[PDB]
Design a protein around this nucleic acid. Structure first.
Lengths: 182, 166, 516, 461, 374
RNA sequence: UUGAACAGAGAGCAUUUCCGGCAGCAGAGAUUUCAGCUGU
């Protein structure tokens, strides 16, 4: 912590007060900084599900390469994860080990969907807006940031009517019709 | 054995007593060469026992010319006769470290019991006390040593060139 | 040379249950002279000790000491100590587990709800106030105020000086008790799982996982002398553990029911355990005798603590009660609650206090000051306990006035001389010695030749066989115990000559019986 | 009720003026300082590891070496940094070891200069000027002993006819030379050992036991009138110069390459011989060595004592040198280099801190006697730390974990393989002598310290 | 740390001082915490000679309290154990440490010398010699140390040989201040006066002259003149002959004013041949000084020396028998001066008349003197 | 290599030669300390 001299750094090399090997390079912290994750245990709650997908993918690739059970369940899991939005392509089954990843499950969260739909300028702005209760999917208002938005369910991410944000974008283009409140 | 050290300087003469010898065989090594830069270890080698200051710039210029042309002046005779012990002239002379190999013969002409050393060990002891200067002297001189150096350099140069103000 | 206080500075040694070498004789004589000179000169330092310990003394027979009030102490003592006697009223989060740094400079409080605050309690400087909204249980500093470990809902987390999270430990699954071993740099962890985990803070490496095998860990304390961990279980059993042996070093039967709290003296000699059977028990640690058994407390003692000057602070809910000189051998030092008719041979409480609103969560003495910090349901309260702190610290072990540069260099130096976790034994002086195998006389190779000689001639002298002796009640004759302890189906030459010498013994016993 | 608490007062613990250091109160209670065995065990382990990383013993080679391998070296026993070396091609050189550069070189002879030493030549007509001239004399196989003077810049008292002030002459070759430490005398071994003085041009006395030649020579350093010599009939002969005669000889198994006398004990000497070990002998009883220094793997070429008399240095024909504590009998340290071949001469400088080795590729190299020890002057904090660490390594010396670290060196491949086959050979002969002793009746237990003397004139009672 | 070493060097004397039942443990802990304060201030950074001085004053105060408590408790005046010299030895070592650290304040050096001298029989005069030797080595130019060294070794020990050696070595070092010259002629006159008084005393119970003082007087004039002509006109001799003669005149004025002070404090040594010892300085001043003190300027100084040579027998009391013997000498002096001088004639006449009138029934013989010097 | 007288150093080593006991008395410096004679 004091920038050890040469004899000290030679004499105690494995000493590190910040980065440990159980930390795994602080990647929970790293991807929760990237996608602005509030609570500490969401990374590991997603890591359990990525481990489920990859455990099944291992145990399913250990079946013989031609039997219809392996082919049906590999294709069925691939279709389910593409439809949910974690996987970005349902083509190859090496996605079920390589491209299945806590960052993919985190890119499917509601503020990241928002920021990619240009509905907020950054992920922290999207977090603030859906905490303030501006965003509804479908009819019903969504209030928490961790909400996972599937591919067919991202067509209905809008703002609530009577939103001040909806009002100011309509009045920026002065398409505001005050009959329907905005 | 390098027992005493004579440092001449514009404010006067200094006799130092060598406490610890530096290494002779390892004298070119890195730690021995930079212990004379570190002051905390140079004070383990050198201790000041005497400093006779000059009577003014006139005696300063006289002793600067005598030190320049390699002669023992009367103030040198006084301070060396005060400080150096009456050793033998035939067996184990007292060893004085100077920086001037042609001032040495003038010192043995006056004190035959003194052998004088100016080789690389005495040279880097001398440049250690030159490098530290005012810190070794413990506060006992009047006059800043660089101000006396400016005065003595200008006086020496005008004397050597015979600068007339007429 | 005499030194009336030498036996504090003396040092025990090995004994057998003189020499002809001249050089070794004079070497041992010089060693004994040096040991005597060193003990004497080390014990003459008690002149140089700057301060004096505190006290309070009754000066009357009507003036009992347990009925002296904290406001009366705060009036009677100086303004600096009266300002050290702090009180934080933190009502909304839960009961506050208290913890002090090993020099008394920093305080670390944890609410049960989420509120963890590390602070300089004696200035007004807090340096971490973090609200971790899951139920925290305990915390401790590591080697400094610069890092602290908190035991949260499940995982133990490690935070830096200003409160940023450094580590989430994926092991240490449900901690309830954390304690740091400062000379070994080990964070020790126990809780609702029946597991005890030693984690090296410097390298980052989980040193040991040990099955307690006795359910959740009800109490936990560290011997400051030899760094073994005393855990108290729901059996009424304390067990002393080291990170080398996967079994407990010792298991003591302290109480009935569970063990609510354990405290150890800093000399490593006495241990006070409170059980849930309303029983405080003072234990000798070194010889494992039970010194005192104060049974039938009015309500179960939820905490015990032992100061640096040997006070005993027991806490039974609202009440805190301190006894002086209770950790001694004699039966006149058994801690009582009243003196029946004024008996001087009854250890009445040294002082008591009642936290009338609440139930105290934990106790901890402030290290080098005369205070007892008790954390309770509505925050923190320091109590001015005058006999309760080492007045003369050593400033190069741990310094209450230490600066930032001194903290930096002391951190690097103690990190450099970190003791390995394998050196933790029940006694600390057992890592210079020789094995308790490997014969106590050193061998001079003449006797090695002699040993190999009788190993060659174990046959036909039967030196590895029990000797024939007829009069030894031949149902327990040694040779038949050899024959029965051996497996009864294999036949080797050793057991053949035991059978031969057994028949010889039976025939000699037969003829001795016949002539008798 | 009287009452008193801890009044810390902050004037005694944090100083008033900012320029001065903080008070460090101490309290020597073992309660305050708990882990007293483990803490200094780890300090002794960190001291052994720090020594094994600070071991940088090679100071430097001096000059450019010689052309044909250094076979003779002599320090002068009165000046710290002066060293004379001679090679196989007859060139001798005088060295300032401070600047690592030769004062002078000399094409001294035509053959090998087989010996050289240094003198303060007591002429009784001239007066020796030892403050500006140094004197080295040197014998070779071209039947000459030559005495040279060197211009030396060590005092600046004066201001000159340097080389070859005289030329002693023998009829047969010479093989060794050593100068008496007084009274103008030296001795040369060769076909026969002669005594000389620097005035007369002929030997004063021939002091030879028999008609068997002499390979080496050393004068004693105190009791200066006792000579010792090694003859090629595996013989070690002592001479006395009061009686002007030999004194006693012993015959060993193999040939003694060198002797050096103990400068602090005046009757002990160490021989360095061709079975690969050194023998520490008492002059008053040559029937047993009082040590054997065993760790070399080829023939030991040269030995020398520390001027403190406490350790010896020992260079051998396996291209490595070894330093031995005098009371142990195994090597404290081994120095090797891929560039160093066949170290034929080793001296121990009068500082007792550096070790001069002359190899046979040509080079003369300086080493530190203590590898981890630096030569700066030390403040009292670092001096106290260093001697605390020395005492701590001393009292934990035999713990297995620090013994395996302090015992460790990198030895070359050839010396390591010779070492392990030497181990399995010695273990085999111990197995076979144990069997033979189990059977046979009267097998005497001969000591290791007596196992190398085949005989001794003037038997001991 | 070294404060720890010094503090635990202080413990055997208080072992002994608790065993001898005068101090108690609770008060000796108080003197140890005060001494801890002082030792830490001594050997930490930013140290001061006032820290040394206050430590010496504290140690002397606890020594005086220890003596008072010994006389009151044990009713002896020393316990002849460790605790009656250890504290004075401590004070001497604090002085030695302070003079090794700050060897520049002569106040502290002289406090060291005063305490070491006043320690009495218990100290050693070679221990005072050692600190005189190192102080004179460090300050060779400061002259009062030479005077104090020689004054201690003559006015206490009466060591004439060593005192002569001290004065000759000091005059070797700084032969420029006249104060050392005057104290050397003072010492030589005191030595010759003690010599002739011990001769007179051995006569009254039962060659070697002031020519030593005259020879050191002669070299005093020569070397003081040389050092003033070298001190002024400092760097070079770039000055024309007007400035050279102005300089040489001024050095004559300087040197002759010092010899005026020499005779003025020379007259009071009246136990030797004071007439001869003043007349030799008169004849040493009477000769030529290479720039015509008589035949040119410094004629006022020539008149001053003529007045001195006139009154050199008339240095007498109002009992003027010497005046009635040799006032004709003063009349011939005034006649020989007024035979040449012009205004110094009238000046010397009026001055000798005013001097004799000021210095000299009794008014009737004084009326004869007034008629003589009228 | 020894001897002699001389000049010294404070840098070593003994031992019972005296003192660090008491007064009487004069002396010394700034009311405390300092310096010698006649006996205990």
């Amino acid at each position: 912590v004091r920038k050890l001299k040469h004899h000290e750094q030679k004499l105690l090399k494995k000493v590190d007060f910040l980065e440990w090997k159980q930390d795994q390079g602080h990647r929970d912290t790293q991807v929760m900084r990237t996608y602005h994750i509030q609570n500490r245990e969401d990374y590991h709650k997603y890591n359990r599900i990525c481990g489920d997908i990859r455990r099944l993918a291992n145990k399913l690739s250990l079946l013989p390469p031609t039997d219809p059970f392996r082919r049906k369940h590999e294709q069925l899991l691939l279709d389910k994860l593409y439809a949910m939005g974690v996987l970005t392509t349902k083509s190859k089954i090496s996605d079920l080990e390589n491209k299945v990843t806590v960052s993919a499950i985190c890119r499917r969260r509601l503020p990241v969907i928002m920021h990619r739909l240009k509905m907020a300028e950054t992920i922290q702005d999207a977090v603030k807006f859906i905490e303030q209760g501006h965003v509804r999917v479908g009819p019903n208002l969504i209030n928490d940031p961790a909400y996972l938005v599937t591919r067919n369910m991202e067509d209905y991410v809008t703002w609530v009517d009577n939103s001040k944000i909806k009002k100011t974008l309509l009045r920026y283009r002065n398409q505001i019709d005050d009959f329907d409140f905005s | 054995p390098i027992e005493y050290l004579l440092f001449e300087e514009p404010t006067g003469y200094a006799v130092f007593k060598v406490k610890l010898q530096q290494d002779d065989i390892g004298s070119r090594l890195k730690e021995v060469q930079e212990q004379i830069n570190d002051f905390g270890a140079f004070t383990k080698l050198i201790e000041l026992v005497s400093f006779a200051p000059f009577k003014g710039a006139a005696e300063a210029l006289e002793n600067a010319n005598d030190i320049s042309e390699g002669l023992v002046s009367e103030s040198l005779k006084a301070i060396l006769d005060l400080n150096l012990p009456k050793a033998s002239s035939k067996k184990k002379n007292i060893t004085l470290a100077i920086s001037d190999k042609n001032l040495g013969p003038s010192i043995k002409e006056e004190f035959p019991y003194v052998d004088c050393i100016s080789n690389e060990l005495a040279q880097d002891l001398i440049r250690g006390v030159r490098l530290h200067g005012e810190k070794l002297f413990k506060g006992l001189q009047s006059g800043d040593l660089e101000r006396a150096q400016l005065g003595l350099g200008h006086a020496y140069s005008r004397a050597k060139v015979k600068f007339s103000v007429q | 040379k005499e030194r009336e206080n030498q036996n504090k500075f003396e040092r025990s040694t090995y004994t057998n249950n003189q020499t002809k070498d001249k050089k070794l004789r004079a070497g041992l004589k010089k060693i004994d002279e040096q040991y005597k000179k060193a003990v004497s000169s080390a014990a003459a330092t008690d002149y140089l000790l700057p301060e004096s310990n505190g006290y309070l003394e009754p000066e009357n027979e009507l003036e009992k000491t347990f009925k002296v009030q904290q406001s009366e102490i705060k009036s009677s003592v100086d303004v600096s100590t009266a300002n050290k006697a702090l009180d934080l009223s933190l009502k909304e989060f839960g009961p506050y587990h208290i913890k002090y740094a090993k020099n008394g400079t920093h305080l670390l409080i944890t609410g049960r709800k989420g509120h963890v605050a590390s602070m300089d309690w004696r200035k007004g400087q807090l340096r971490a106030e973090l609200f971790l909204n899951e139920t925290c249980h305990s915390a401790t500093y590591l080697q400094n105020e610069q890092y602290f470990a908190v035991a949260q809902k499940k995982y133990t987390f490690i935070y830096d000086h200003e409160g940023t999270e450094l580590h989430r430990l994926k092991q240490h699954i449900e901690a309830r008790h954390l304690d740091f071993l400062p000379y070994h740099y080990l964070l020790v962890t126990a809780g609702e799982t029946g597991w005890l985990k030693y984690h090296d803070v410097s390298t980052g490496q989980l040193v040991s996982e040990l099955r307690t095998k006795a359910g959740p860990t009800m109490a936990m304390a560290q011997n400051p002398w030899n760094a073994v961990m005393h855990l108290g279980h729901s059996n009424g059993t304390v067990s002393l553990w080291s990170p080398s042996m996967p079994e407990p070093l010792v298991k003591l039967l302290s109480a009935r029911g569970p063990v609510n709290s354990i405290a150890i003296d800093r000399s490593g000699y006495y241990m006070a355990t409170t059980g849930a059977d309303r029983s405080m028990k003072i234990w000798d640690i070194r010889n494992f005798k039970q010194l005192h058994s104060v049974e039938s407390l009015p309500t179960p003692g939820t905490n015990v603590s032992i100061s640096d000057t040997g006070l005993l602070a027991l806490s039974r809910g609202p009440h805190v009660t301190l006894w002086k000189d209770a950790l001694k051998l004699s039966g006149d030092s058994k801690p009582c609650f009243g003196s029946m008719g004024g008996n001087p041979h009854r250890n009445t409480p040294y002082m008591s206090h009642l936290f009338a609103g609440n139930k105290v969560e934990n106790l901890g003495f402030v290290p080098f000051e005369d205070l007892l910090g008790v954390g309770h349901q509505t925050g923190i309260t320091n109590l001015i306990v005058p006999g309760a702190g080492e007045a003369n610290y050593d400033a190069l072990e741990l310094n209450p006035f230490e600066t930032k540069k001194q903290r930096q260099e002391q951190e690097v130096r103690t990190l450099l001389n970190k003791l390995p976790a394998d050196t933790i034994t029940l006694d600390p002086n057992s890592i210079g010695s020789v094995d308790k195998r490997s014969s106590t006389i050193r061998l001079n190779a003449k006797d090695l030749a002699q040993t190999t000689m009788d190993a060659n001639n174990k046959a036909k002298t039967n030196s590895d066989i029990p000797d024939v002796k007829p009069d030894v009640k031949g149902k327990n004759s040694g040779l038949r115990s050899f024959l029965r302890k051996k497996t009864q189906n294999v036949i080797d030459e050793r057991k053949l000559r035991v059978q031969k010498q057994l028949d010889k013994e039976k025939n000699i016993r037969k003829r001795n019986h016949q002539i008798k | 009720m009287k009452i008193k608490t801890i009044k810390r007062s902050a004037d005694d613990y944090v100083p008033v003026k900012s320029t001065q250091e903080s008070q460090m109160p101490r309290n020597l209670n073992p309660e305050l300082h708990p882990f007293e065995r483990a803490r200094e065990y780890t300090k002794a382990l960190n001291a052994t590891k720090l020594e094994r990383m600070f071991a940088k013993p090679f100071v430097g080679q001096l000059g450019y070496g010689h052309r044909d391998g250094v076979y003779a070296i002599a320090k002068n026993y009165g000046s710290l940094n002066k060293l004379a070396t001679g090679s196989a091609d007859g060139v001798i050189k005088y060295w300032n070891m401070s600047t690592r550069e030769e004062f002078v070189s000399f094409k001294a002879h035509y053959g090998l200069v087989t010996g050289l030493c240094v003198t303060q030549p007591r002429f009784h007509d001239k007066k020796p000027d030892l403050k500006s001239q140094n004197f080295m004399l040197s014998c070779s196989d071209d039947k000459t002993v030559k005495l040279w003077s060197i211009n030396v810049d060590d005092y600046s008292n004066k201001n000159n006819e340097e080389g070859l002030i005289r030329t002693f002459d023998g009829e047969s070759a010479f093989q060794g030379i050593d100068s008496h430490r007084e009274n103008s005398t030296f001795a040369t071994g060769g076909a026969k050992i002669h005594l000389w003085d620097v005035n007369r041009l002929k030997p004063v006395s021939d002091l030879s036991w028999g008609a068997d030649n002499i390979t080496s020579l050393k004068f004693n350093q105190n009791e200066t009138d006792i000579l010792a010599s090694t003859g090629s009939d595996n013989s070690i002969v002592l001479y006395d110069l009061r009686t002007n005669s030999p004194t006693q000889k012993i015959v060993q198994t193999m040939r003694t390459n060198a002797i050096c006398w103990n400068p602090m004990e005046a009757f002990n000497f160490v021989t360095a011989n061709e079975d690969h070990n050194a023998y520490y002998y008492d002059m008053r009883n040559l029937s047993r060595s009082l040590n054997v220094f065993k760790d070399h793997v080829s023939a030991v070429m040269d030995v020398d004592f520390s001027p403190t008399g406490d350790e010896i240095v020992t260079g051998s024909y396996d291209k490595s040198i070894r330093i031995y504590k005098t009371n142990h009998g195994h090597s404290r340290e081994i120095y090797h280099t891929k560039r160093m071949q066949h170290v034929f001469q080793v001296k121990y400088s009068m500082d007792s801190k550096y070790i001069i080795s002359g190899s046979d590729d040509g080079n003369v190299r300086l080493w530190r006697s203590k590898a981890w020890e630096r030569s700066n002057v030390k403040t009292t904090r670092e001096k106290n730390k260093l001697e605390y660490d020395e005492k701590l390594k001393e009292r934990f010396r035999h713990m297995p974990e620090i013994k395996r670290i302090s015992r460790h060196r990198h030895v070359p491949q050839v010396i390591k393989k010779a070492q392990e086959i030497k181990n399995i050979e010695l273990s085999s002969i111990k197995r076979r002598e144990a069997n033979e002793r189990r059977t046979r009746k009267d097998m005497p237990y001969i000591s290791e310290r007596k196992k190398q003397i085949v005989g001794t004139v003037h038997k001991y009672e | 740390s070294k404060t720890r070493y010094y503090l635990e060097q202080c413990i055997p004397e208080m072992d002994d001082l608790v065993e001898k039942g005068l101090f108690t443990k609770n008060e000796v802990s108080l003197i140890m915490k005060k001494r801890t304060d002082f030792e830490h201030r001594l050997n930490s950074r930013g140290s001061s000679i006032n820290d040394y001085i206050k430590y010496i004053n504290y140690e002397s105060n606890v020594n005086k309290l220890r003596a008072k408590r010994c006389k009151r408790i044990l009713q002896v005046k020393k316990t002849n154990s460790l605790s009656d010299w250890s504290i004075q030895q401590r004070i001497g070592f604090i002085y030695q440490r302070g003079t090794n650290k700050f060897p520049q304040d002569l106040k502290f050096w002289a406090m060291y010398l005063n305490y070491m001298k006043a320690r009495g029989n218990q100290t050693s005069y070679k221990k005072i010699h050692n600190i005189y030797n190192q102080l004179l080595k460090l300050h060779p130019t400061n002259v009062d140390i030479w005077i104090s060294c020689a004054k201690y070794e003559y006015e206490v020990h009466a060591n004439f040989k060593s005192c002569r050696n001290i004065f000759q070595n000091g005059l070797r070092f700084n032969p420029d201040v006249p104060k050392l010259w005057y104290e050397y002629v003072k010492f030589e006159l005191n030595f010759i006066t003690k010599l002739i008084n011990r001769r007179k005393v051995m006569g009254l119970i039962n060659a070697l002259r002031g020519d030593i003082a005259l020879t050191i007087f002669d070299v005093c004039m020569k070397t003081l003149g040389k050092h003033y002509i070298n001190k002024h006109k400092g760097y070079y001799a770039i000055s024309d002959s007007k400035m050279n003669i102005e300089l040489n005149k001024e050095t004559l004025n300087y040197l002759f004013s010092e010899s005026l002070r020499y005779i003025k404090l020379f007259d009071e040594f009246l136990d030797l041949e004071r007439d001869y010892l003043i007349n030799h300085v008169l004849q040493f001043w009477k000769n030529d000084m290479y720039d015509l003190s008589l035949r040119k300027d410094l004629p006022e100084l020539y008149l001053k020396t003529v007045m001195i040579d006139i009154t050199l027998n008339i240095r007498y009391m109002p009992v003027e028998k010497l005046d009635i013997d040799q006032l004709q000498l003063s009349v011939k002096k005034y006649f020989a001066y007024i035979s040449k001088l012009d205004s110094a004639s009238v000046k010397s006449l009026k001055n000798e008349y005013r001097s004799y009138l000021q210095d000299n029934a009794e008014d009737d013989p004084r009326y004869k003197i007034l008629d003589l010097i009228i």
